[PDB]
Amino acid sequence: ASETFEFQAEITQLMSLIINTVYSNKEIFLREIVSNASDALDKIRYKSLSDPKQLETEPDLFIRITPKPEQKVLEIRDSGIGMTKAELINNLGTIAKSGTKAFMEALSAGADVSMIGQFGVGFYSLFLVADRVQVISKSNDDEQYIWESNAGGSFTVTLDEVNERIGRGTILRLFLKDDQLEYLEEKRIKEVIKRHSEFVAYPIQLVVTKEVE
Amino acid sequence: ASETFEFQAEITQLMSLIINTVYSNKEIFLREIVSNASDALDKIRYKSLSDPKQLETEPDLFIRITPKPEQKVLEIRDSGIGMTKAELINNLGTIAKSGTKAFMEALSAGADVSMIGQFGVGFYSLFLVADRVQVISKSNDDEQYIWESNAGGSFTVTLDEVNERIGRGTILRLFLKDDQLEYLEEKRIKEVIKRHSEFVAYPIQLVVTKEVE
Numbered sequence A, B: 001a002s003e004t005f006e007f008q009a010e011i012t013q014l015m016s017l018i019i020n021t022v023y024s025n026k027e028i029f030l031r032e033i034v035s036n037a038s039d040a041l042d043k044i045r046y047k048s049l050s051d052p053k054q055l056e057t058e059p060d061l062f063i064r065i066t067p068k069p070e071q072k073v074l075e076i077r078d079s080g081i082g083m084t085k086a087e088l089i090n091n092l093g094t095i096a097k098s099g100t101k102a103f104m105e106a107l108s109a110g111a112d113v114s115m116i117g118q119f120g121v122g123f124y125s126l127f128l129v130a131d132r133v134q135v136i137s138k139s140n141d142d143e144q145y146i147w148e149s150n151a152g153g154s155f156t157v158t159l160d161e162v163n164e165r166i167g168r169g170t171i172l173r174l175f176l177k178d179d180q181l182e183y184l185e186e187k188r189i190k191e192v193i194k195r196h197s198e199f200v201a202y203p204i205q206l207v208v209t210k211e212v213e
């Protein structure tokens, strides 16, 4: 059974700003995702310096992108530290974030949306291309859980009994907007990664499905 | 919680024959898989001729092959009719199969293992390349279940709360033997499909993971 939580009030305004004031350079949503994935991977690796067993739930360190064009879904998986239920609730919307108001004021004064990660709120850039998001996460210290939002004022957290097991880490599952289906394409993905994600210490894999001809 | 079932006694001998008398032309295991997938897809499509709603749990008709080299696993998914719990128990080992004994006698007299599907027992050819198998299946008339065997005299059936949801159909998950890892390779898979699976009415997709370079 899901629990429902209410977003802290400036997070709700930030999301509705991102959905509705919008327009240009939406592709930076993937740079923010990859940069969060890389932060999560840095954390497990640093953690494991003095607790090597932490690594054993998923020994390989990677970022993987899987288009699912039939569901209009883009998934980005990392094998980073992952998040517990309580981390999903606290850190993904119930507690105020330090740069939320400041980024909104920056935006209104003319700042590029691209600055969003410098405000510590770049996760919310995913609503540029998606009207719905699931974050499926598995921390070594908890069970697998699904966080879900349609950017509507509330989110749900649900013990995961429906998705593949990740050994450890997170899957970001974007239900893309009908106008943003270009991010389902191999060539577009590669261009965006090569443009804004050149210096990443982890391998970035792309999963492509082709017909045997 | 899993239930355990015992294999009918000639199925156990067939499996241990396949594991141990062996040697040559192991690649026909994929022709048998694809041919079963195609039979399952024919059945849903025929069924839907007079009950079109059956199709709506998974509108696309396909066979998909996904190597997972890090787990030494080959998955083959179809969106065919799927099987209920009771069909997995009955049809995947507890009840005697008509050609089991006859195929064993044919084999001993010198028959090519390749004849196995002409005896109606070709599912068991997967133990040529795998020491363990899961069949994860979702029929419109039941929940998702996992059947599992290590070819040891018994199998388990378990309500699925750990794998991705299939809308409808089956995933064959092969834990390949260390000597049979060639079936993890894109080029080998394609050769085997092109050789023995030329006339298939459904698209066969291959899922390939590559590093963004």
Ligand SMILES: COC1=C2C[C@@H](C)C[C@H](OC)[C@H](O)[C@@H](C)/C=C(\C)[C@H](OC(N)=O)[C@@H](OC)/C=C\C=C(/C)C(=O)NC(=CC1=O)C2=O
Residues within 6 Å of the ligand: A035, A036, A037, A038, A039, A040, A043, A078, A080, A081, A082, A083, A087, A091, A092, A120, A121, A122, A123, A124, A135, A170
């Ligand atoms: C310092 O780390 C970062 C923080 C502080 C805090 C949340 C860290 C978090 O604590 C529980 C974990 O330490 C860390 C492993 C999890 C992230 C990197 C997640 O990424 C994935 N792939 O796990 C990302 O997932 C949706 C979650 C929230 C982001 C908020 C809404 C924001 O937008 N920006 C941030 C980007 C960051 O790099 C941020 O606030």
Ligand SMILES: COC1=C2C[C@@H](C)C[C@H](OC)[C@H](O)[C@@H](C)/C=C(\C)[C@H](OC(N)=O)[C@@H](OC)/C=C\C=C(/C)C(=O)NC(=CC1=O)C2=O
Residues within 6 Å of the ligand: B035, B036, B037, B038, B039, B040, B043, B078, B080, B081, B082, B083, B087, B091, B092, B120, B121, B122, B123, B124, B135, B170
């Ligand atoms: C006539 O159909 C076939 C039968 C008769 C009977 C089992 C049919 C089954 O009834 C419940 C469903 O109608 C059908 C949709 C399911 C299969 C095609 C499955 O394939 C997948 N992809 O679903 C395959 O899965 C592991 C299962 C068992 C095979 C036994 C051990 C054997 O080896 N060979 C057979 C190959 C066949 O084509 C066989 O006995």
